[PDB]
Design a protein around this ligand. Structure first.
Ligand SMILES: [Cl-]
Ligand SMILES: [Cl-]
Ligand SMILES: [Cl-]
Ligand SMILES: [Cl-]
Ligand SMILES: [Cl-]
Ligand SMILES: [Cl-]
Ligand SMILES: [Cl-]
Ligand SMILES: [Cl-]
Ligand SMILES: [Cl-]
Length: 239
């Protein structure tokens, strides 16, 4: 049933919510046109990896990020964040750990070309596994798979090309996702939405784009009526 609504929405349904509704995707389009493409992608990757335990709303954090780096020539991402995070409104917590995470991913990013980034976009499972190893993280880390997701947005924008997320990458299990999964099952959300994903044909990183909006009574209006009614039906089933 849930499976049917999500299959009916499909990848293309998720693609539309991402490109018309998702406020993080919009934040990224904003930054892109005011940044070097290579640095833009690398910054989104670094930003994602420290987007946990925020001192603000997720959507405000990503706009703050967008506006801060718009116009800013960046030499060292690590240094940029050393200045950025302590001054920030929405991410002013666990700064020592986050800067060290940035220091750590930056070594990796600094070796990559725009072409490398593009190859990783054609091979998102490989970016996934690479980050797991440079960061020393669990495969199902919510921060790791959110980074792959945002990398997807960034690369979608920069390379003008839609590539769906791999079926294999689990949903980012943050509190909101934990919440909605409560009223449906007792299994781990990472495990549950993989199942829902396998049957509906919609990769769990795309499913995530469907759940998180229906949760803040957000915009629906640049969408198509049929998609909206599908989205309205899903909000019923979730509760
Ligand atoms: Cl589809
Ligand atoms: Cl949030
Ligand atoms: Cl976030
Ligand atoms: Cl704010
Ligand atoms: Cl405020
Ligand atoms: Cl701190
Ligand atoms: Cl810390
Ligand atoms: Cl290049
Ligand atoms: Cl764009």
């Amino acid at each position: 049933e849930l499976v049917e609504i999500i299959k009916g929405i499909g990848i293309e349904g998720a693609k539309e919510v991402e490109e018309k509704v998702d406020r993080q995707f919009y934040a990224l389009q904003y930054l892109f046109r005011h940044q070097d493409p290579e640095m833009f992608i690398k910054l989104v990757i670094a930003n994602s990896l420290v987007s946990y335990q925020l001192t603000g709303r997720g959507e405000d954090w990503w706009w703050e990020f967008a506006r801060y780096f718009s116009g800013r020539e960046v030499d060292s991402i690590w240094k940029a964040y050393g200045e950025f995070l302590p001054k920030s409104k929405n991410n002013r917590r666990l700064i020592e750990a986050k800067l060290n995470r940035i220091r750590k991913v930056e070594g990796f990013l600094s070796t990559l070309t725009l072409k490398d980034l593009e190859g990783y976009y054609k091979n998102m499972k490989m970016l996934w596994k690479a980050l797991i190893k440079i960061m020393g993280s669990r495969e199902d880390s919510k921060t790791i798979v959110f980074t792959v997701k945002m990398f997807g947005y960034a690369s979608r924008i920069a390379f003008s090309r839609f590539i769906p997320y791999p079926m294999e990458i689990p949903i980012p299990e943050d509190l909101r996702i934990k919440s909605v999964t409560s009223k449906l099952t007792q299994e781990k959300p990472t495990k549950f939405w993989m199942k829902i994903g396998q049957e509906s044909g919609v990769p769990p990183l795309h499913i995530d784009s469907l759940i998180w909006p229906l949760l803040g009574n957000a915009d629906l209006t640049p969408l198509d009526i049929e998609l909206r009614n599908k989205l309205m039906k899903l909000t019923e089933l979730l509760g």
